[PDB]
């Protein structure tokens, strides 16, 4: 089964990336299954809603009492060294919150890291129906 492990915030870096202290080591975490508009896009740069997604993730993790990380069932790091995880702030999944708010889309899914896929797709569908942010 998947289980959560505690972590401590170091710095929110962008909408889709946060640096955490995990098992006593600083590490960069990429949020699984979501694509946010980025402020730090490799080519693009600062896309529309980038600033908004980035501020949303930052507030959510900076104002939390407890941060937890949840790994999926496949690879736990990507080719850049970043942890691949679902991040929880006081019990609430940051990945889902972003999608629910129309501040992220569900990404292209590489099995078998897809455990919360349907759940996020349901939230994405609701944000589209409500025409929030990216979908407005």
Curated annotation (Swiss-Prot):
UniProt-annotated location(s) = Secreted
User: Which residue intervals are annotated with compositional bias (Basic and acidic residues) in the record?
Assistant: 116-132
Which positions are annotated as binding Ca(2+)? Answer: 16, 35-36
User: Disulfide connectivity?
Assistant: none
Q: Where is this region: Disordered?
A: 116-136
The catalytic residues are 30, 38, 82
Q: At the top level of its lineage, which domain of life is listed?
A: Bacteria
The protein, known as: Nuclease A
| Species this protein is from | Staphylococcus aureus
Taxonomy-wise, where does this protein's organism fall, top ranks first?
Bacteria, Bacillati, Bacillota, Bacilli, Bacillales
């Amino acid at each position: 089964k998947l289980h959560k492990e505690p972590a401590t915030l170091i710095k929110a870096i962008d909408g889709d990336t946060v640096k955490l202290m995990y098992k006593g080591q600083p590490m960069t975490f990429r949020l699984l299954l979501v694509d946010t508009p980025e402020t730090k896009h490799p080519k693009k740069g600062v896309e529309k809603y980038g600033p908004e997604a980035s501020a949303f993730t930052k507030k959510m993790v900076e104002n939390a009492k407890k941060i937890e990380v949840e790994f999926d069932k496949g690879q736990r790091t990507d080719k850049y060294g970043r942890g691949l995880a679902y991040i929880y702030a006081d019990g609430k999944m940051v990945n889902e919150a972003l999608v629910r708010q129309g501040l992220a889309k569900v990404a292209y899914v590489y099995k078998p890291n897809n455990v919360h896929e349907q759940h996020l797709r349901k939230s994405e569908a609701q944000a589209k129906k409500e025409k929030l942010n990216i979908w407005s």
